[PDB]
Amino acid sequence: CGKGYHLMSFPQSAPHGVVFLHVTYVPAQEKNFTTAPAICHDGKAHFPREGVFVSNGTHWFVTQRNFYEPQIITTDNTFVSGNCDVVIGIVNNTVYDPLQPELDS
Amino acid sequence: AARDLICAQKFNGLTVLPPLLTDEMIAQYTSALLAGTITSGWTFGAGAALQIPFAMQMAYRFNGIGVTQNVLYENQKLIANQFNSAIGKIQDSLSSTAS
Numbered sequence: 137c138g139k140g141y142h143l144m145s146f147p148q149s150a151p152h153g154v155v156f157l158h159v160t161y162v163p164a165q166e167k168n169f170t171t172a173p174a175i176c177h178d179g180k181a182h183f184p185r186e187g188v189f190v191s192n193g194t195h196w197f198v199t200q201r202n203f204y205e206p207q208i209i210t211t212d213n214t215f216v217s218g219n220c221d222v223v224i225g226i227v228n229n230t231v232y233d234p235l236q237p238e239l240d241s
Numbered sequence: 242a243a244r245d246l247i248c249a250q251k252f253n254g255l256t257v258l259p260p261l262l263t264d265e266m267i268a269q270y271t272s273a274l275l276a277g278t279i280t281s282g283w284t285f286g287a288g289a290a291l292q293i294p295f296a297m298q299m300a301y302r303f304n305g306i307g308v309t310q311n312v313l314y315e316n317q318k319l320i321a322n323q324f325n326s327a328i329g330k331i332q333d334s335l336s337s338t339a340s
């Protein structure tokens with residue numbers, strides 16, 4: 137159904153045949169980023185639920201794979217598995233907890 | 242020495258034509274496909290080639306088949322050893338069996 141990520145298709149009539157108009161999704165403008173497989177926070181390894189850990193020159197974010205939409209790393213979009221002594225390439229960063237400012241205020 | 246069968250075929254009007262792509266061109270295409278698969282994953286087949294580390298690409302592949310990606314990151318050396326052993330068994334089978 138065409139080259140790229142397929143979205144729709146439209147048939148058209150032709151003599152002794154058919155013509156398909158394949159609508160696809162093509163990514164356009166990429167950008168280099170620094171990535172890590174996990175985030176080590178409080179002695180626990182954090183893995184993203186869906187998406188990928190990326191970084192600019194100072195901060196660390198989580199974004200989806202096919203579009204750059206960076207978001208704050210939080211316990212809602214990450215899950216915990218094991219400690220930091222197993223994963224190769226783990227980095228040190230903090231993970232936000234939404235319950236603490238709601239409980240404090 | 243003796244008359245070949247190919248000479249007897251050629252003397253009677255039968256001719257074999259060479260293909261358009263030589264074996265070096267097929268090897269170049271195969272090497273390009275292998276390098277694009279290893280370095281980029283499946284991104285090079287749907288547009289521009291985007292780089293990704295191979296461990297993270299294999300975590301993506303495990304997440305495709307319904308296994309969480311911490312299984313790879315906690316068992317990376319074992320899976321690498323299993324892949325290397327399987328490639329070695331294919332090499333041994335291709336050196337041994339010809340059927």
Ligand SMILES: *[C@@H]1O[C@H](CO)[C@@H](O)[C@H](O)[C@H]1NC(C)=O
Binds near residue numbers: 166167168
């Ligand atoms: C990313 O980095 C490579 C090498 O440092 C460079 O060739 C390339 O232009 C950069 N940008 C993109 C969008 O790939």
Ligand SMILES: *[C@@H]1O[C@H](CO)[C@@H](O)[C@H](O)[C@H]1NC(C)=O
Binds near residue numbers: 192193194195
């Ligand atoms: C990284 O992104 C954060 C949030 O947008 C920003 O505050 C910071 O200045 C950025 N750092 C660099 C080096 O661009």
Ligand SMILES: *[C@@H]1O[C@H](CO)[C@@H](O)[C@H](O)[C@H]1NC(C)=O
Binds near residue numbers: 176228
């Ligand atoms: C990450 O933090 C731990 C403890 O806070 C420390 O032992 C380790 O060296 C840090 N890693 C890096 C790369 O600084």
